Design a protein around this ligand. Structure first.
Ligand SMILES: NC(=O)C1=CN(Cc2ccc(CO)cc2)C=CC1
Ligand SMILES: NC(=O)C1=CN(Cc2ccc(CO)cc2)C=CC1
Ligand SMILES: NC(=O)C1=CN(Cc2ccc(CO)cc2)C=CC1
Ligand SMILES: [Zn+2]
Ligand SMILES: [Zn+2]
Ligand SMILES: [Zn+2]
Ligand SMILES: [Zn+2]
Ligand SMILES: [Zn+2]
Ligand SMILES: [Zn+2]
Ligand SMILES: [Zn+2]
Ligand SMILES: [Zn+2]
Lengths: 352, 349, 350, 350
């Protein structure tokens, strides 16, 4: 698609319960401190679905909403006083914006900003204009990470399919020494990247759990030491491979009550369960004799800027091979339909 | 406001700081202009001002003061998250904001800051010892609210710097550990209070001056020791001859560093905090216990600065301050030289 | 220096969408004027003609769209005086022969020879204004707009002129104590409500489906607002104490709406069917419409009226909302129009 | 070559879809060269052959697909000198006998003996490039690419070469002041424009179906762009002062486009029919086409041509939009190929 003036194509969620639609909205202009990006790739994500399935009550993200919370692009116009990027610069968009000033933000951890709810700072494509348009605004230089000559299509999923699993893993990386076992439940958009991250940054043994045969082989293709079929037999299968020793960490990318249950029955004493996937209602039960002593559970949120940099560094060293399928802006809504039915293999990416 | 303002500047190499009149700055996009409420002095200012002409490229004239507190006076274009009137402490060690270190909150260790020419206020950029001051970014301001400006000033250095040193190794300082603090004047005095507040470690003070030792007692040091060749053996006796987990040397002379190496425990840590040009630890087999790490730490982090204020706000830190006026700036530096300042000096415009 | 060719938004094939295409920059023959287009409005009419089926097509293609044109004088043809280069002019849409009785009376839009001679308007038969340059046939089709913003002027050549002429036809009836009912507070109706407040002292009643438009109507001078549909007739009658309405300006033109009109018009009143819905018509017969109630489908407006619309605008008395598009985005603007998500009138700026 | 088995995509049964397979790794005979495939492009032509029916089937499957092949030399067959193991080479597609008069003139694509000798192109009868490794028959059929990205080079072997040949056939006619009409700005047409810009001073006019396609034409160096359809002949002539275009490269190849072409082509000009549509053909007779305007259906490209295409590429003068797939997504890509849901050219990277 060619740049053609004062408006741009965007993929907007317009009405609750409706499908998203392509619209020609005005191209924004960066205020002072803001940056305008020419979007070069915008990732689709299952999360996008969840948000679009909230009822009139639940949903508090305001309409219309340009979707797309995984976004990379080139610098188009710098707002007033923004130095430290030049027009043409390829950047990835750091997703979970924060106040930049509370204790958490001051330590890098914006994803856990203690203020961004109050101040109404929301991420692009999840409350602020997202990346699935020809252009987007980013509030602050602080939320741009350089990516150099990385391919945008492969870069885009890094902002979430890379960052989110990286963070979860990172939370307990000291535990994942040689000898340790990491269980990755689900080999979807996130699972298949988590596996690679586990290999690149740790020496843990990785055991993948999914339903389809071709998923298990995908798991093997990307570095999973072993692969087992998810379901009521998955716990025993894992205990089998672990010699009954139980796994150091379980990263549940699926996040169903099924999988969380498995995770609780395989997790090692003094291990960790990280519930990364959203299924409304699904929850671990952490109480004496319902989970091993010392086994900590958490639901992590996205990742940190230093993480996002670290993820880009992995990709730029050829350590991450994200599986993509390219779409057009126009194909935007059609891509969503593809996602609901779970036929997109790997991660879908829109390319203006 | 006004067209110009007073400022304590270092104008030529090897001269005294003089109060001169210079344009009142105006904040560009991204900047904040503060009405300064407190500007601190320390020996660091004296150090920089004793660099010879020979070692000199650029810098002059310089507005001094890297220990700055003020209130927001005007917001540059775009700047949000502060309102005019806000009481703020200036974070000293500025960084690029975008490298790995800066993204982790460790701007004191910004790897791009040399090459980009980002110098701290009063050490390369305009300092806090003037009527007004520019801060480059909102992210260099830390709220203090209620806290008295004059108490806040020294925290930005005298507080931050020991805090960071101790923070690097605080995991080691659990119940039963021993911290040695060499030099209990400026940074060490705050150092003991920090150690008392964030740790259960046994604190041993070491100094040359006898009454300094007694005062160090008052702020929570568990034993006193007199610097010198006796110091090592005395400390060992106090630690039942098992060595000290951590030695924070705030003097930083060869003598003290030598003491440090002779008292540090196996797998311990030595923080060389005080600068004496040339002086250094000798880290190598059979010259320091196995596993005993040594570092020259630099200033502190934003997180840390916040934690410092929090400590102060809760009444856990107390530095004695002596107040000067902005005109008395040069007169204050003079007093610092002859060591006739009890506690830290603070200029109040 | 203009270049041999220029971009133009054109309807190239029946059922297709508008495309930005390259075509020769024209030069003015004797009597013609060339304008550098400064603004060009779209409206639903563009959509209507674009929806004519193949069955019906005979000639016309390709067609540079845009009957709502504003420009500045670029080059004058041989023999043309009365306009200088640089002059900002709006283009009079419904071109006529100039020599029949209706033309001579200053009612070109009702020219009796225009069809026989194949005099078609720009954007609907002749090259329209949705290009970098455009040709106007006579100086008599240019109307000075002074320093009025071209973007503000563009919609007036239709959204302004059309409801003006429809109201003008029956303006003497609309003295103090009269009631005008405006059906359709979309494009034309929004401007029409403004016209009624400026040129008359009638009481204006807005009628529309969408409540958001009903509020918008009030802010522009609507004395009262009623929701379209079966309830509307009774509801209007309520607001007039049963006495009907002097004049009903139907901007929608739907059978249902014309039907409401016939039930609410006063005796010796008037109904102006201004919107087009193929086949929708009034039924003017005994006991099926009040005595003396006259019905008409007006067509656009006269040059005199257009000057008057400009003067209203320049005096601050007409405030139509515009969203600007660039020439390259022409088709973009048409799809927004087609899915009806343009607040007010869209205007294209070469 | 390590690994006795390798992955590949193949056409295994008539009318059915290509499927992923595990076949033995080939070993280069005397005079053959074995490549490790760095990139294997797709194109519509692959569909065309898979679409031919059962009835019109004689002798030639399973078939490793892929006629756009790039690789590094893995192992050198007996006596083969001229390349080092590790050398990045593109596979020239139209294999010829190498000994007929055409072949001795560089023009191997028009070899008069290759059909009589069943010499078929790689992936169109011979083992294709779409696998981990492939066999090339002769060093004559490798062209070095140096440090050019394989993903970029692969399309060049067809989307580059084919237009390039077409254009070259008549390049002496494309002097300053000539006009070249490119019909269709899809894969080939896009690259055709950029070639015309590098190698000639001809003025280029693009014709296409879609508003985006026309803007893209303009972006890649078209001086003008008009919409295909009944109107497209006159559209062009308007741009050319009614003079007609010296050359017309129809990359679409519909009867309608060839018809357009016959109406725009200049006297003593040329029409190059470069796209396949079963049945579509020019009508070269008196009064059906200007005197001296020649027509041809060119076939692919010559070896020295591929080399020149690579030189353009290496000097940043040839842009080609690529989308990467994996060997397993091969069949997936071929589906997307059918729905014309792929921008530019698809490339498979093992
Ligand atoms: N931290 C996580 O598990 C997820 C982070 N995101 C962005 C997002 C943010 C908020 C929601 C609603 O929960 C969902 C998705 C992407 C994958 C899962
Ligand atoms: N150990 C440290 O980093 C300290 C921080 N400062 C500011 C500073 C830093 C560096 C210099 C160089 O002379 C001076 C002054 C004050 C005491 C020591
Ligand atoms: N006009 C040409 O020469 C073409 C060359 N190719 C390869 C090809 C094409 C068609 C066939 C017959 O189906 C065979 C091989 C790609 C595009 C056009
Ligand atoms: Zn996502
Ligand atoms: Zn925050
Ligand atoms: Zn200091
Ligand atoms: Zn930095
Ligand atoms: Zn109109
Ligand atoms: Zn007439
Ligand atoms: Zn091909
Ligand atoms: Zn031959």
């Amino acid at each position: 698609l060619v740049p053609r003036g004062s408006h741009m194509k965007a993929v907007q969620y317009t009405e609750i319960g409706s499908e998203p639609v392509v619209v020609d909205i005005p191209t924004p202009t960066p205020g002072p401190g803001e940056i305008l990006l020419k979007v070069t790739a915008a990732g689709l994500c299952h999360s996008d679905i969840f948000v679009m399935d909230m009822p009139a009550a639940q949903y508090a993200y305001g309409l219309p909403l340009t979707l797309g919370h995984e976004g990379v692009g080139t610098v188009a116009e710098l707002g007033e006083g923004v130095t430290g990027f030049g027009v043409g610069d390829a950047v990835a968009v750091y997703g979970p914006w924060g106040c930049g000033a509370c204790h958490a933000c001051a330590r890098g951890r914006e994803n856990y900003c203690t203020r961004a709810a109050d101040l109404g700072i929301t991420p692009p494509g999840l409350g602020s204009p997202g990346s699935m348009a020809e252009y987007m605004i980013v509030d602050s230089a602080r939320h741009l990470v350089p990516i150099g000559d990385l391919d945008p299509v492969a870069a885009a999923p890094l902002t979430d399919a890379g960052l989110t699993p990286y963070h979860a893993i990172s939370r307990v990386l000291p535990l994942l020494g040689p000898g340790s076992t990491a269980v990755v439940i689900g080999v979807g958009g996130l699972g298949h990247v988590g596996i690679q991250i586990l290999r690149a940054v740790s020496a843990a043994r990785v055991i993948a759990v999914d339903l389809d045969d071709d998923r298990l082989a995908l798991a093997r293709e990307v570095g999973a030491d072993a692969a087992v079929k998810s379901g009521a037999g998955a716990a025993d299968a894992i205990r089998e491979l672990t010699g009954g020793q139980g796994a150091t960490a379980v990263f549940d990318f699926v996040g169903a009550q099924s999988t969380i249950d498995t995770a609780q029955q395989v997790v090692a004493v003094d291990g960790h369960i990280s519930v990364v996937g959203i299924h409304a209602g699904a929850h671990a039960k952490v109480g004496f004799f319902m989970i091993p002593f010392g086994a900590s559970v958490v639901t992590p949120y996205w990742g940190t800027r230093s993480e996002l940099m670290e993820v880009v560094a992995l990709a730029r060293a050829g350590r991450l091979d994200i599986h993509t399928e390219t779409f057009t802006l126009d194909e935007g809504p059609a891509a969503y339909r593809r996602l609901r039915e779970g036929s997109i293999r790997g991660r879908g990416v829109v390319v203006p």
